[PDB]
Write a protein that holds these residues in place. Structure first.
Motif, PDB file in Angstrom:
ATOM      1  N   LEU A 198      -9.583  -9.438  12.410  1.00 29.08           N
ATOM      2  CA  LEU A 198      -8.991  -8.148  12.732  1.00 29.08           C
ATOM      3  C   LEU A 198      -7.782  -8.301  13.639  1.00 29.08           C
ATOM      4  CD1 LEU A 198     -11.792  -7.138  11.623  1.00 29.08           C
ATOM      5  CD2 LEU A 198     -11.410  -5.168  13.114  1.00 29.08           C
ATOM      6  N   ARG A 199      -7.764  -9.326  14.487  1.00 31.65           N
ATOM      7  CA  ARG A 199      -6.588  -9.562  15.311  1.00 31.65           C
ATOM      8  C   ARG A 199      -5.371  -9.845  14.450  1.00 31.65           C
ATOM      9  NH1 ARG A 199      -6.635 -12.784  20.739  1.00 31.65           N
ATOM     10  NH2 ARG A 199      -4.659 -11.624  20.775  1.00 31.65           N
ATOM     11  N   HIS A 200      -5.505 -10.757  13.490  1.00 28.72           N
ATOM     12  CA  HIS A 200      -4.364 -11.072  12.646  1.00 28.72           C
ATOM     13  C   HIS A 200      -3.953  -9.877  11.804  1.00 28.72           C
ATOM     14  CE1 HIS A 200      -2.139 -12.850   9.226  1.00 28.72           C
ATOM     15  NE2 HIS A 200      -1.677 -13.662  10.158  1.00 28.72           N
ATOM     16  N   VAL A 201      -4.921  -9.137  11.269  1.00 26.70           N
ATOM     17  CA  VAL A 201      -4.585  -7.988  10.438  1.00 26.70           C
ATOM     18  C   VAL A 201      -3.866  -6.927  11.257  1.00 26.70           C
ATOM     19  CG1 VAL A 201      -5.574  -6.060   9.197  1.00 26.70           C
ATOM     20  CG2 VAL A 201      -6.316  -8.368   8.693  1.00 26.70           C
ATOM     21  N   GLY A 202      -4.344  -6.668  12.470  1.00 24.65           N
ATOM     22  CA  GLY A 202      -3.690  -5.681  13.309  1.00 24.65           C
ATOM     23  C   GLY A 202      -2.269  -6.070  13.655  1.00 24.65           C
ATOM     24  N   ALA A 203      -2.041  -7.354  13.923  1.00 26.46           N
ATOM     25  CA  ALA A 203      -0.684  -7.808  14.188  1.00 26.46           C
ATOM     26  C   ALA A 203       0.209  -7.584  12.981  1.00 26.46           C
ATOM     27  CB  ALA A 203      -0.692  -9.279  14.584  1.00 26.46           C
ATOM     28  N   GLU A 204      -0.324  -7.794  11.779  1.00 28.22           N
ATOM     29  CA  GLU A 204       0.459  -7.555  10.574  1.00 28.22           C
ATOM     30  C   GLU A 204       0.890  -6.104  10.481  1.00 28.22           C
ATOM     31  OE1 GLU A 204       1.499  -9.691   8.368  1.00 28.22           O
ATOM     32  OE2 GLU A 204       0.567 -11.345   9.469  1.00 28.22           O
ATOM     33  N   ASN A 205      -0.042  -5.181  10.697  1.00 28.10           N
ATOM     34  CA  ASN A 205       0.288  -3.772  10.542  1.00 28.10           C
ATOM     35  C   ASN A 205       1.323  -3.337  11.561  1.00 28.10           C
ATOM     36  OD1 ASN A 205      -1.442  -3.510   8.410  1.00 28.10           O
ATOM     37  ND2 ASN A 205      -3.126  -2.697   9.636  1.00 28.10           N
ATOM     38  N   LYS A 206       1.190  -3.800  12.800  1.00 28.05           N
ATOM     39  CA  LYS A 206       2.166  -3.439  13.815  1.00 28.05           C
ATOM     40  C   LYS A 206       3.545  -3.969  13.463  1.00 28.05           C
ATOM     41  CE  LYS A 206      -0.864  -2.907  17.733  1.00 28.05           C
ATOM     42  NZ  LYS A 206      -1.276  -3.464  19.037  1.00 28.05           N
ATOM     43  N   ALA A 207       3.623  -5.214  12.999  1.00 32.09           N
ATOM     44  CA  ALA A 207       4.917  -5.775  12.643  1.00 32.09           C
ATOM     45  C   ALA A 207       5.552  -5.004  11.499  1.00 32.09           C
ATOM     46  CB  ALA A 207       4.771  -7.245  12.280  1.00 32.09           C
ATOM     47  N   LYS A 208       4.754  -4.596  10.517  1.00 33.48           N
ATOM     48  CA  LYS A 208       5.303  -3.806   9.426  1.00 33.48           C
ATOM     49  C   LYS A 208       5.875  -2.497   9.938  1.00 33.48           C
ATOM     50  CE  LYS A 208       2.786  -5.378   5.394  1.00 33.48           C
ATOM     51  NZ  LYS A 208       1.649  -5.050   4.503  1.00 33.48           N
ATOM     52  N   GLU A 209       5.241  -1.912  10.947  1.00 29.09           N
ATOM     53  CA  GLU A 209       5.745  -0.661  11.492  1.00 29.09           C
ATOM     54  C   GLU A 209       7.092  -0.855  12.166  1.00 29.09           C
ATOM     55  OE1 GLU A 209       2.862   1.067  13.888  1.00 29.09           O
ATOM     56  OE2 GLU A 209       3.353   3.141  13.381  1.00 29.09           O
ATOM     57  N   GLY A 268      10.294 -16.651  -0.324  1.00 30.44           N
ATOM     58  CA  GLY A 268      10.072 -16.131  -1.652  1.00 30.44           C
ATOM     59  C   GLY A 268       9.107 -14.976  -1.737  1.00 30.44           C
ATOM     60  N   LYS A 269       8.569 -14.522  -0.617  1.00 28.34           N
ATOM     61  CA  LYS A 269       7.585 -13.452  -0.592  1.00 28.34           C
ATOM     62  C   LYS A 269       8.294 -12.134  -0.340  1.00 28.34           C
ATOM     63  CE  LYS A 269       3.637 -11.298   0.389  1.00 28.34           C
ATOM     64  NZ  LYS A 269       2.890 -11.878   1.528  1.00 28.34           N
ATOM     65  N   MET A 270       8.171 -11.199  -1.270  1.00 27.87           N
ATOM     66  CA  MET A 270       8.810  -9.903  -1.120  1.00 27.87           C
ATOM     67  C   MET A 270       7.829  -8.898  -0.542  1.00 27.87           C
ATOM     68  SD  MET A 270      10.779  -7.546  -3.874  1.00 27.87           S
ATOM     69  CE  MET A 270      12.072  -8.746  -4.124  1.00 27.87           C
ATOM     70  N   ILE A 271       8.299  -8.119   0.423  1.00 27.04           N
ATOM     71  CA  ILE A 271       7.450  -7.252   1.229  1.00 27.04           C
ATOM     72  C   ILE A 271       7.503  -5.836   0.686  1.00 27.04           C
ATOM     73  CG2 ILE A 271       7.044  -6.355   3.517  1.00 27.04           C
ATOM     74  CD1 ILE A 271       6.391  -9.294   2.971  1.00 27.04           C
ATOM     75  N   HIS A 272       6.348  -5.188   0.625  1.00 25.20           N
ATOM     76  CA  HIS A 272       6.234  -3.816   0.159  1.00 25.20           C
ATOM     77  C   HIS A 272       5.879  -2.911   1.326  1.00 25.20           C
ATOM     78  CE1 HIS A 272       5.241  -5.273  -4.193  1.00 25.20           C
ATOM     79  NE2 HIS A 272       6.501  -5.473  -3.851  1.00 25.20           N
ATOM     80  N   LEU A 273       6.663  -1.858   1.516  1.00 22.54           N
ATOM     81  CA  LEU A 273       6.449  -0.911   2.596  1.00 22.54           C
ATOM     82  C   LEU A 273       6.214   0.476   2.028  1.00 22.54           C
ATOM     83  CD1 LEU A 273       9.148  -1.915   5.180  1.00 22.54           C
ATOM     84  CD2 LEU A 273       6.766  -2.550   5.111  1.00 22.54           C
ATOM     85  N   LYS A 274       5.437   1.272   2.749  1.00 21.12           N
ATOM     86  CA  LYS A 274       5.177   2.655   2.386  1.00 21.12           C
ATOM     87  C   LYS A 274       5.996   3.565   3.285  1.00 21.12           C
ATOM     88  CE  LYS A 274       2.163   2.921  -0.231  1.00 21.12           C
ATOM     89  NZ  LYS A 274       0.703   2.749  -0.018  1.00 21.12           N
ATOM     90  N   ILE A 275       6.681   4.529   2.685  1.00 22.38           N
ATOM     91  CA  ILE A 275       7.578   5.415   3.411  1.00 22.38           C
ATOM     92  C   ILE A 275       7.410   6.828   2.885  1.00 22.38           C
ATOM     93  CG2 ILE A 275       9.989   6.085   3.490  1.00 22.38           C
ATOM     94  CD1 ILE A 275      10.704   3.299   4.175  1.00 22.38           C
ATOM     95  N   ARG A 276       7.358   7.797   3.792  1.00 22.99           N
ATOM     96  CA  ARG A 276       7.306   9.199   3.402  1.00 22.99           C
ATOM     97  C   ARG A 276       8.708   9.665   3.053  1.00 22.99           C
ATOM     98  NH1 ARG A 276       3.028   9.814   6.580  1.00 22.99           N
ATOM     99  NH2 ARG A 276       1.238  10.959   5.731  1.00 22.99           N
ATOM    100  N   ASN A 277       8.930  10.004   1.790  1.00 23.63           N
ATOM    101  CA  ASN A 277      10.248  10.436   1.363  1.00 23.63           C
ATOM    102  C   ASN A 277      10.517  11.847   1.864  1.00 23.63           C
ATOM    103  OD1 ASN A 277       8.486  11.834  -0.241  1.00 23.63           O
ATOM    104  ND2 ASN A 277       9.043  10.760  -2.126  1.00 23.63           N
ATOM    105  N   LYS A 278      11.648  12.406   1.439  1.00 20.96           N
ATOM    106  CA  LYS A 278      12.014  13.746   1.868  1.00 20.96           C
ATOM    107  C   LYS A 278      11.074  14.810   1.330  1.00 20.96           C
ATOM    108  CE  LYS A 278      15.218  14.283  -1.938  1.00 20.96           C
ATOM    109  NZ  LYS A 278      14.150  14.992  -2.692  1.00 20.96           N
ATOM    110  N   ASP A 279      10.216  14.469   0.378  1.00 22.14           N
ATOM    111  CA  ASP A 279       9.259  15.409  -0.178  1.00 22.14           C
ATOM    112  C   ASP A 279       7.871  15.247   0.416  1.00 22.14           C
ATOM    113  OD1 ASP A 279      11.237  16.452  -1.786  1.00 22.14           O
ATOM    114  OD2 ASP A 279      10.794  15.083  -3.441  1.00 22.14           O
ATOM    115  N   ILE A 287      11.427  -4.934   0.377  1.00 22.74           N
ATOM    116  CA  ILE A 287      12.278  -5.481   1.421  1.00 22.74           C
ATOM    117  C   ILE A 287      12.267  -6.996   1.329  1.00 22.74           C
ATOM    118  CG2 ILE A 287      12.764  -5.496   3.870  1.00 22.74           C
ATOM    119  CD1 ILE A 287      13.058  -2.869   2.779  1.00 22.74           C
ATOM    120  N   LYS A 288      13.421  -7.598   1.556  1.00 20.72           N
ATOM    121  CA  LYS A 288      13.551  -9.035   1.715  1.00 20.72           C
ATOM    122  C   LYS A 288      13.862  -9.328   3.174  1.00 20.72           C
ATOM    123  CE  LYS A 288      16.433  -9.905  -1.718  1.00 20.72           C
ATOM    124  NZ  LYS A 288      17.362  -9.363  -2.738  1.00 20.72           N
ATOM    125  N   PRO A 289      12.847  -9.503   4.008  1.00 19.41           N
ATOM    126  CA  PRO A 289      13.080  -9.603   5.445  1.00 19.41           C
ATOM    127  C   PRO A 289      13.634 -10.956   5.832  1.00 19.41           C
ATOM    128  CG  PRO A 289      10.894  -8.799   4.972  1.00 19.41           C
ATOM    129  CD  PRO A 289      11.420  -9.378   3.710  1.00 19.41           C
TER     130      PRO A 289
END
Lengths: 498, 498
Positions: A198-209, A268-279, A287-289
């Motif tokens: 859970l420590r590693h997973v939580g760090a992942e989510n925070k970094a994505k934010e 070579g790893k492409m990142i997928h992010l979730k974003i609330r659009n204007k709707d 994203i290619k970070p």
């Protein structure tokens, strides 16, 4: 009600006891007449005239939290017979939990301040994470709903702790030209999670934010990504932790952050992010970070006696090679990201070349291991360089308000000083008279004090210490050439032992 | 009057207040009835039954010195109108001066203790500098006249501070075979002398005094020198200071000591010493000295967080080359002084070879930079090796009673353990059950406690601390496998803030 104290004005405390009493009332249930007892005396003191902070007032405020914990333990024992140790431990945990809940539920709003100097008008804006919105909802997947996360919420696995977007701009020709924009946050690791998974997973989510916020700083990139096209993003992250486990587990904090960045920038790893659009609908973007991660350390623990210098430099070497190339001689030509930016022949070349040269100088002589009068010499230039070459600068502390706030002020001072067509100052040099005036205005007219109050309940900064053996001080008395202003930056910060 | 406290027995304090009151009476003049007031209450407490050390008793004893200073300042202001700061500073200096005078004038006498283990009888002897005499007067030029120098006399330029000769012997066949003999002293530099010229001169005189004591340890060499023949002397000096100026000016202390040794061992320079012969007449002897000077550092400041490791190792490298030769690989053959001793083919070869091998091992892995369960791993073996190859071992601390006392106990424990035809223990290993029993007996039945009381007025040791963050402790709880004995070694040591 206006005779302000030289230090610890009565109104500041006035707010502090109310916040603590509200937390205690929440845990108990607003039924104990004892709480009403000193609450009534507090209301009596509400109309009382303001006074200098007498030692009695400071002592009473300082010890109030401990007294409240003892009262809760006594109530617990009476309701349920428990040993003193067990009741005390349980009471402390419950009290902290309630305080975090209350501090989280208060509204979070943008902070705007105006500064004037030499016939120029500058504006400082702090945009909280709950306000980054396109349409009518914040862009983040797990919605904030106008509320935030405090620096004390150390068990959250869904949100980055204290996320703000900091901007400074100057008004010219009826327009606002942006001079600097960056991202400031707390550390990327949940502290007290016990499960390493859970420590590693939580760090992942925070970094994505943090990545989501950085993308929002560039509207053109955001629009392209929302149009369905993969987008390349460059980010420079600067950590300000000392990286030693001797005193406070700041070492493991650092490896957790570095591991998180590595997992998002796997080649070579492409990142997928979730974003609330204007709707108001979740939408996936690609994203290619590209992240250059640093850690410097700006404490007395790192600069006077010296902790984790060797540990941090292993990370910093890789990041510099990523940023400037494989040749770090001060006279060579820049490579890496700086080289790619310069290859476009921009009209920005003068500033970029100067900053790159100074950074190599500091690295060569290890000047960042001491504080030759100013301790943020390397961190400040890294952030400024990142903004010049069109990357996104981001910096963080343990909690994201004390050392983060100080670095915020340092960057703003240098940007304002440079904007007057000047050059950059030399590394490890005290500010002159004009620079000191700029720094004094910035430290009070930036949004840091409001961030402090929002995140804690009182304004202050823990970086201002004045230790007893004089050789262990960081020398801000000289950088801030004013005793009263120095005492004003360090506000109620010494009364927040928590 | 006998119900002893678990810690801080009443009689120990009983002595402490009398000493402090005597100093105050000396400075004032035995006329203030206020002094007689609590003196009479003290005499009332004299006949009172012994009690556990209540917090009131400990607090009253702890704060007595501060109260006495305040009283002196008040008397000073009444007699002569002075500001509070000036009176306080003057009073503190005068009080310290009087205490040093009184502590110096008390008689200094040899200390003898007996220890029994496994049907063997051992004797520990501490011979003070005032007792080293041939004929009827002490050998030192500036005569002691039965008095001594305390560790607090930091402005003395004529005498070494706290000079003792330590011996352990075993009784066999109606005889006493000497197992170990060494010299323990304070540091060789006057602390608070301001003139660098007087500082260097004072260090010279103190070092010469240590050399005189070392010569006295070898009667055959002393007789030859008294016969008019130049004599060669080999000495191994071990310093236990941390060598950093951050906290307490122990850095400059080290260079002062090293400079003094260098000035006496200038190549081709023959040293002239003055010695009182059996007729009480000063006589000049000629010495060819040879000193190997070390510094290790055994504090938490040096072992946990690590101070002056780099500074000290520059000295230690030269000394090892002097002692073992130019090849320090653990498998090579010994050279230097050890090689010269072994070239005579003594029946001592087994122990010497083992000690040399272990020292090279510790040096190779830098094991002395940490405390793998026992922090004196290198210092203790250096002293034991020096005695084996017929040199003279000498070790010192800042004051010569706390860290010096602990190293004294460590050496005695190992000598006794080895005397039972055993081998030597491995570096960085906790003592076993039998070794722990030996160590417990040594720590109490050595003369260290009496040295502590003589030099200060109360028995104790400042090496036993129990710091608040548990990772900063030196791990003597494990080496001394007994809580009560550990609490007994650390006596009134915490009440001697001075």
């Amino acid at each position: 009600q206006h005779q302000k104290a030289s230090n610890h004005s009565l109104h500041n405390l006035y707010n502090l006891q109310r916040d603590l009493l509200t937390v205690a009332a929440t845990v108990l249930g607003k039924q104990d007449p004892v709480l009403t007892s000193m609450a009534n005396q507090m209301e009596l003191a509400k109309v009382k005239a303001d006074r200098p902070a007498t030692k009695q007032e400071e002592a009473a405020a300082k010890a109030l939290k401990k007294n409240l914990i003892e009262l809760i333990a006594a109530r617990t024992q009476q309701q349920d017979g428990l040993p003193a140790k067990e009741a005390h431990r349980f009471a402390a945990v419950a009290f902290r939990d309630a305080q975090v809940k209350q501090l989280n539920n208060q509204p979070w709003q943008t902070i705007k301040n105006t500064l004037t100097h030499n016939g120029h008008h500058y504006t400082n804006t702090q945009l909280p994470a709950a306000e980054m919105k396109i349409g009518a909802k914040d862009i983040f997947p797990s919605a904030y709903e106008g509320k935030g996360v405090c620096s004390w919420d150390t068990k959250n696995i869904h949100h980055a702790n204290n996320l703000w977007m900091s901007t400074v701009s100057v008004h010219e020709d009826g327009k606002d030209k942006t001079l600097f924009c960056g991202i400031r946050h707390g550390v990327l690791s949940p502290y007290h999670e016990k499960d390493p998974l859970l420590r590693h997973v939580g760090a992942e989510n925070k970094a994505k934010e943090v990545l989501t916020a950085a993308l929002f700083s560039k509207p053109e990139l955001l629009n392209k990504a929302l149009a369905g096209e993969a987008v390349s993003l460059k980010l420079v992250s600067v950590g300000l932790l000392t990286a030693s486990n001797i005193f406070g587990k700041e070492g493991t904090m650092v490896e957790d952050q570095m591991r998180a960045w590595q997992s998002l920038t796997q080649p070579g790893k492409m990142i997928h992010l979730k974003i609330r659009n204007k709707d108001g609908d979740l939408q996936t973007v690609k994203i290619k970070p590209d992240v250059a991660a640093f850690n410097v350390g700006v404490n007395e623990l790192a600069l006077k006696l010296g902790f984790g210098l060797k540990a941090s430099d292993s990370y910093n070497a890789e990041a510099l090679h990523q940023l400037l190339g494989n040749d770090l001689r001060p006279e060579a030509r820049p490579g890496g990201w700086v080289g790619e930016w310069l290859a476009q022949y921009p009209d920005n070349y003068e500033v970029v070349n100067t900053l790159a040269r100074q950074i190599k100088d500091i690295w060569k002589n290890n000047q960042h291991h001491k504080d030759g009068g100013e301790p943020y010499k390397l961190a400040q230039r890294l952030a400024m360089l990142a903004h010049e070459i069109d990357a996104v600068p981001a910096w963080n502390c343990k909690s994201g308000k004390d050392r983060t706030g100080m670095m915020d002020s340092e960057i703003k001072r240098e940007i304002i000083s440079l904007h007057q067509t000047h050059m950059l100052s030399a590394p490890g040099s005290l500010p002159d008279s004009g620079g000191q005036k700029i720094f004094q205005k910035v430290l009070l007219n930036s949004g840091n004090l409001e961030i402090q109050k929002q995140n804690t309940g009182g304004a202050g900064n823990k970086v201002m210490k004045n230790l007893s053996p004089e050789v262990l001080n960081l020398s801000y008395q000289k950088r801030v050439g004013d005793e009263n202003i120095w005492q004003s930056v360090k506000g109620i910060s010494s009364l927040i032992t928590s």
